[PDB]
Design a protein around this ligand. Sequence first.
Ligand SMILES: CC(C)(COP(=O)(O)OP(=O)(O)OC[C@H]1O[C@@H](n2cnc3c(N)ncnc32)[C@H](O)[C@@H]1OP(=O)(O)O)[C@@H](O)C(=O)NCCC(=O)NCCS
Ligand SMILES: [Mn+2]
Ligand SMILES: [Mn+2]
Ligand code: NA
Length: 219
Amino acid sequence: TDQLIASVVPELLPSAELYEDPPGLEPLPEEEPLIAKSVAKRRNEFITVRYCARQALSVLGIPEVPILKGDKGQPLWPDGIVGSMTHTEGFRGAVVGRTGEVRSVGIDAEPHDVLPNGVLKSIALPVERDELDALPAGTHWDRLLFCAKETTYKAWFPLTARWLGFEDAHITIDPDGTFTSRILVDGRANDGTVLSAFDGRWIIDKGLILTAIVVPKLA
Ligand SMILES: CC(C)(COP(=O)(O)OP(=O)(O)OC[C@H]1O[C@@H](n2cnc3c(N)ncnc32)[C@H](O)[C@@H]1OP(=O)(O)O)[C@@H](O)C(=O)NCCC(=O)NCCS
Ligand SMILES: [Mn+2]
Ligand SMILES: [Mn+2]
Ligand code: NA
């Protein structure tokens, strides 16, 4: 009803989220090596986010399956599926969709708080600093910019297999719940197209920021 991800992605991309770790969850056997020596926060975020991912996959008709990690950390979905996952204090969530419907999806959740000391200087272009200062009072625009940049990478990486730095995209945030990401580097993609700009959506609720980008199919 009031799920954050569902508010920022199309209905044809099922999503699921939780705000706490249900007690007693375990990963699938194939997933255990990915968190073998991990601390409690990492184990629990990994397990619960995959619980949410499998719930969303079931809506698309896909029964229980491991969700392993690819070359540079990207989640590895079944044939015909794209998706994205995110976890932070107070949130685990996942979204999935069919490749016949969209090219890529990225999401990212952050607490709705001022960025840690020094992070804004590291991630924002000078022009972005000025733009954030101009936006209306009452939202942590610095944290929203950071969130949006991470969503940009998540949407970009499965389509390019290349790094994208914080300095390599200019994100413009609108108060209306949308943002744009303008790519400043070579945007050639692995399907033969060029990625120059992404359209994003954002919501703040439950003390969290959630950003999302869907990269549509082309004609
Ligand atoms: C990878 C990264 C984006 C993760 O974002 P984050 O906000 O720190 O963490 P989240 O909890 O939201 O997301 C973590 C999940 O992202 C996904 N992920 C990791 N690497 C990924 C990649 N290369 N491509 C897509 N998704 C990826 C994984 O599913 C991971 O969860 P898991 O390890 O449990 O499977 C971030 O840590 C990072 O390294 N960023 C550097 C690149 C960047 O953001 N550039 C800005 C471009 S403008
Ligand atoms: Mn996380
Ligand atoms: Mn994040
Ligand atoms: Na690579």
